[PDB]
Design a protein around this nucleic acid. Structure first.
Length: 84
RNA sequence: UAAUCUUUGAAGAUU
């Protein structure tokens, strides 16, 4: 539901990672992840995500899935300019 | 989720 491209690429959320994470119910990783801007965040890997403090594999899997959706929309030039 | 928490992220727990 919040795991859809329309929701994941909302500029308001992309520009406020704690809130982006909250929508995915992943806000416990906000301290670990919020210092990285979205455009860098979506390209982190499983190994890096764990180094940063995403200790639950299920969480890293959900993160990587959401990231790849954003990437596809970024590649297709389908994220609003106001997110940049 | 009405809310909060857990990871397995579709479910479970608590109030």
């Amino acid at each position: 539901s919040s795991m859809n491209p329309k929701s994941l690429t909302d500029p308001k959320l992309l520009k406020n990672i704690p809130m982006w994470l909250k929508s995915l119910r992943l806000h416990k990783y906000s301290d670990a992840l919020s210092g990285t801007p979205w455009i860098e965040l979506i390209y982190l890997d499983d190994e890096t995500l764990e180094k940063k403090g995403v200790l639950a594999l299920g969480a890293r899997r959900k993160l990587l899935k959401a990231f790849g959706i954003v990437i596809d929309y970024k590649e297709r030039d389908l994220i609003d300019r106001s997110a940049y």
